[PDB]
Amino acid sequence: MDSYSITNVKYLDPTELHRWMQEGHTTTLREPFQVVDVRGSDYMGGHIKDGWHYAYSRLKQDPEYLRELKHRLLEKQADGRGALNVIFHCMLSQQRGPSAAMLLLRSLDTAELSRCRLWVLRGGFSRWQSVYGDDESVTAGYLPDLWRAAAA
């Protein structure tokens, strides 16, 4: 990235993330990626496989928590190819997704700006599960019952 502007935050569709997961890296530059689920208690009911769970509320209130995430991400990037593609997502298409990305972006030094690419998954986990919810290879801890529209 080149600056600390909101325009540096990119958006990804579920179909493209799924493709990255199938291949094990991004399609264009073959770079690594890491999903960061920033939901709180609404994390319940299923999540993207191999993603990390860092609640937005705590990232925003605890600088040490944000620092921990940054450190983990950069540590993973150091042993990988090129820049690490970090993907943030919420439950739905919410403002907390890009806000979480901005929190990380603002915590990066000018030297670390080039080590990451920031993305937000359009639609959140809600859109994700409507398509890949029952796909065991990309979704973990899924509870079909909770997402039933016309249940009990």
mmCIF file of C-alpha atoms in Angstrom:
data_model
loop_
_atom_site.group_PDB
_atom_site.id
_atom_site.type_symbol
_atom_site.label_atom_id
_atom_site.label_comp_id
_atom_site.label_asym_id
_atom_site.label_seq_id
_atom_site.Cartn_x
_atom_site.Cartn_y
_atom_site.Cartn_z
ATOM 1 C CA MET A 1 0.000 0.000 0.000
ATOM 2 C CA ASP A 2 1.058 3.624 -0.511
ATOM 3 C CA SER A 3 -0.838 5.604 2.133
ATOM 4 C CA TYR A 4 -3.190 5.507 5.103
ATOM 5 C CA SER A 5 -6.287 6.470 3.114
ATOM 6 C CA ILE A 6 -9.496 4.420 3.128
ATOM 7 C CA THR A 7 -9.042 3.894 -0.632
ATOM 8 C CA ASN A 8 -6.306 1.373 0.220
ATOM 9 C CA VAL A 9 -8.941 -1.031 1.536
ATOM 10 C CA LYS A 10 -10.098 -3.429 -1.192
ATOM 11 C CA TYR A 11 -13.209 -5.619 -1.363
ATOM 12 C CA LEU A 12 -13.491 -9.302 -2.182
ATOM 13 C CA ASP A 13 -16.451 -11.487 -3.195
ATOM 14 C CA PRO A 14 -17.039 -14.908 -1.533
ATOM 15 C CA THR A 15 -16.435 -16.709 -4.844
ATOM 16 C CA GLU A 16 -12.932 -15.238 -5.136
ATOM 17 C CA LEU A 17 -11.953 -16.073 -1.546
ATOM 18 C CA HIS A 18 -13.208 -19.611 -2.083
ATOM 19 C CA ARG A 19 -10.973 -19.883 -5.144
ATOM 20 C CA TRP A 20 -7.978 -18.655 -3.116
ATOM 21 C CA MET A 21 -8.725 -21.277 -0.475
ATOM 22 C CA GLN A 22 -8.919 -24.070 -3.059
ATOM 23 C CA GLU A 23 -5.534 -23.073 -4.540
ATOM 24 C CA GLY A 24 -3.824 -22.184 -1.273
ATOM 25 C CA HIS A 25 -2.825 -18.699 -2.433
ATOM 26 C CA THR A 26 -4.128 -15.683 -4.332
ATOM 27 C CA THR A 27 -4.861 -16.173 -8.024
ATOM 28 C CA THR A 28 -2.952 -13.181 -9.424
ATOM 29 C CA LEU A 29 0.354 -13.019 -7.525
ATOM 30 C CA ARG A 30 0.214 -16.409 -5.797
ATOM 31 C CA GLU A 31 0.617 -14.639 -2.454
ATOM 32 C CA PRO A 32 -0.547 -15.974 0.928
ATOM 33 C CA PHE A 33 -3.684 -14.764 2.690
ATOM 34 C CA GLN A 34 -5.162 -14.760 6.188
ATOM 35 C CA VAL A 35 -8.800 -14.380 7.196
ATOM 36 C CA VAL A 36 -9.558 -12.324 10.307
ATOM 37 C CA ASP A 37 -13.079 -12.746 11.720
ATOM 38 C CA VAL A 38 -13.829 -9.636 13.804
ATOM 39 C CA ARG A 39 -17.276 -10.639 15.049
ATOM 40 C CA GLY A 40 -18.024 -10.765 18.764
ATOM 41 C CA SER A 41 -20.433 -13.275 20.256
ATOM 42 C CA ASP A 42 -22.048 -13.354 16.806
ATOM 43 C CA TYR A 43 -19.097 -15.547 15.809
ATOM 44 C CA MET A 44 -21.399 -18.381 16.916
ATOM 45 C CA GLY A 45 -22.837 -20.726 14.310
ATOM 46 C CA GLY A 46 -19.883 -21.229 11.995
ATOM 47 C CA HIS A 47 -16.732 -19.584 10.649
ATOM 48 C CA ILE A 48 -14.300 -19.695 7.746
ATOM 49 C CA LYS A 49 -11.749 -22.503 8.035
ATOM 50 C CA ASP A 50 -8.278 -21.513 9.262
ATOM 51 C CA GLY A 51 -9.341 -17.922 9.942
ATOM 52 C CA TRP A 52 -8.404 -16.064 13.140
ATOM 53 C CA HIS A 53 -10.974 -14.691 15.583
ATOM 54 C CA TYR A 54 -10.232 -11.147 16.853
ATOM 55 C CA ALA A 55 -13.322 -9.303 18.125
ATOM 56 C CA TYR A 56 -13.640 -5.755 16.789
ATOM 57 C CA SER A 57 -14.664 -4.340 20.179
ATOM 58 C CA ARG A 58 -11.459 -5.556 21.797
ATOM 59 C CA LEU A 59 -9.220 -4.545 18.889
ATOM 60 C CA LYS A 60 -10.630 -1.032 19.233
ATOM 61 C CA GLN A 61 -10.408 -0.846 23.038
ATOM 62 C CA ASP A 62 -7.179 -2.747 23.692
ATOM 63 C CA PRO A 63 -4.063 -1.449 21.845
ATOM 64 C CA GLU A 64 -2.137 -4.522 23.014
ATOM 65 C CA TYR A 65 -4.703 -6.782 21.379
ATOM 66 C CA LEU A 66 -4.353 -4.929 18.077
ATOM 67 C CA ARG A 67 -0.582 -5.074 18.486
ATOM 68 C CA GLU A 68 -0.816 -8.847 18.968
ATOM 69 C CA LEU A 69 -2.769 -9.238 15.721
ATOM 70 C CA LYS A 70 -0.331 -7.016 13.811
ATOM 71 C CA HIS A 71 2.636 -8.992 15.134
ATOM 72 C CA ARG A 72 1.071 -12.336 14.202
ATOM 73 C CA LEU A 73 0.215 -11.138 10.710
ATOM 74 C CA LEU A 74 3.674 -9.711 9.989
ATOM 75 C CA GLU A 75 5.319 -12.824 11.398
ATOM 76 C CA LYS A 76 3.337 -14.941 8.926
ATOM 77 C CA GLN A 77 4.163 -12.531 6.093
ATOM 78 C CA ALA A 78 7.908 -12.689 6.793
ATOM 79 C CA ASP A 79 8.060 -16.421 6.005
ATOM 80 C CA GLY A 80 5.858 -16.163 2.937
ATOM 81 C CA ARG A 81 6.009 -15.038 -0.679
ATOM 82 C CA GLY A 82 5.446 -11.329 -1.289
ATOM 83 C CA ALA A 83 2.782 -9.377 0.582
ATOM 84 C CA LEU A 84 0.241 -10.995 2.890
ATOM 85 C CA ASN A 85 -3.381 -10.482 1.914
ATOM 86 C CA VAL A 86 -5.388 -9.850 5.083
ATOM 87 C CA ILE A 87 -9.158 -10.361 4.833
ATOM 88 C CA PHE A 88 -11.530 -8.860 7.414
ATOM 89 C CA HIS A 89 -15.198 -9.771 7.710
ATOM 90 C CA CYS A 90 -18.235 -9.289 9.900
ATOM 91 C CA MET A 91 -21.620 -10.995 10.133
ATOM 92 C CA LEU A 92 -23.292 -8.927 7.408
ATOM 93 C CA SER A 93 -22.247 -6.056 5.128
ATOM 94 C CA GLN A 94 -21.377 -3.871 8.108
ATOM 95 C CA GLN A 95 -19.279 -0.769 8.700
ATOM 96 C CA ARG A 96 -17.183 -2.657 11.252
ATOM 97 C CA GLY A 97 -15.477 -4.603 8.475
ATOM 98 C CA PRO A 98 -13.693 -1.654 6.847
ATOM 99 C CA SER A 99 -13.275 0.008 10.271
ATOM 100 C CA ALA A 100 -11.297 -3.012 11.489
ATOM 101 C CA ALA A 101 -9.133 -2.827 8.369
ATOM 102 C CA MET A 102 -8.488 0.878 9.031
ATOM 103 C CA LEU A 103 -7.416 0.099 12.604
ATOM 104 C CA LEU A 104 -4.723 -2.260 11.343
ATOM 105 C CA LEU A 105 -3.714 0.071 8.518
ATOM 106 C CA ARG A 106 -3.205 2.995 10.876
ATOM 107 C CA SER A 107 -1.026 0.836 13.141
ATOM 108 C CA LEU A 108 1.450 0.032 10.347
ATOM 109 C CA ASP A 109 4.748 1.890 9.871
ATOM 110 C CA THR A 110 5.642 3.329 6.475
ATOM 111 C CA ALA A 111 8.028 0.378 6.118
ATOM 112 C CA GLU A 112 5.295 -2.145 6.919
ATOM 113 C CA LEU A 113 2.784 -0.583 4.517
ATOM 114 C CA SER A 114 4.216 -2.622 1.639
ATOM 115 C CA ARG A 115 4.049 -5.927 3.518
ATOM 116 C CA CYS A 116 0.246 -6.218 3.533
ATOM 117 C CA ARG A 117 -2.779 -5.773 1.266
ATOM 118 C CA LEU A 118 -6.065 -5.214 3.092
ATOM 119 C CA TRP A 119 -9.408 -6.678 2.036
ATOM 120 C CA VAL A 120 -12.973 -6.838 3.332
ATOM 121 C CA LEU A 121 -15.191 -9.786 2.392
ATOM 122 C CA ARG A 122 -18.402 -8.388 0.889
ATOM 123 C CA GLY A 123 -21.475 -9.746 2.634
ATOM 124 C CA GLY A 124 -19.783 -11.116 5.742
ATOM 125 C CA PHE A 125 -20.227 -14.638 7.034
ATOM 126 C CA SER A 126 -23.945 -14.436 6.311
ATOM 127 C CA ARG A 127 -23.401 -14.321 2.548
ATOM 128 C CA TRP A 128 -20.559 -16.816 2.841
ATOM 129 C CA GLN A 129 -22.692 -19.508 4.489
ATOM 130 C CA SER A 130 -25.551 -19.067 2.012
ATOM 131 C CA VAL A 131 -23.138 -20.452 -0.583
ATOM 132 C CA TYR A 132 -20.452 -22.467 1.224
ATOM 133 C CA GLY A 133 -22.023 -23.049 4.632
ATOM 134 C CA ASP A 134 -22.294 -26.818 4.217
ATOM 135 C CA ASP A 135 -18.905 -27.143 2.493
ATOM 136 C CA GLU A 136 -16.719 -28.847 5.112
ATOM 137 C CA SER A 137 -13.535 -27.980 3.225
ATOM 138 C CA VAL A 138 -13.949 -24.211 3.662
ATOM 139 C CA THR A 139 -16.410 -23.758 6.550
ATOM 140 C CA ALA A 140 -15.880 -24.916 10.140
ATOM 141 C CA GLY A 141 -18.248 -25.367 13.080
ATOM 142 C CA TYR A 142 -21.329 -24.716 10.955
ATOM 143 C CA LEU A 143 -24.698 -25.135 12.684
ATOM 144 C CA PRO A 144 -27.406 -25.488 9.969
ATOM 145 C CA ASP A 145 -30.197 -25.204 12.532
ATOM 146 C CA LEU A 146 -29.373 -21.607 13.463
ATOM 147 C CA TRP A 147 -29.574 -20.411 9.860
ATOM 148 C CA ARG A 148 -32.930 -22.022 9.051
ATOM 149 C CA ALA A 149 -35.263 -19.286 7.793
ATOM 150 C CA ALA A 150 -38.565 -21.071 8.420
ATOM 151 C CA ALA A 151 -37.563 -23.161 11.438
ATOM 152 C CA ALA A 152 -39.558 -23.745 14.635
#
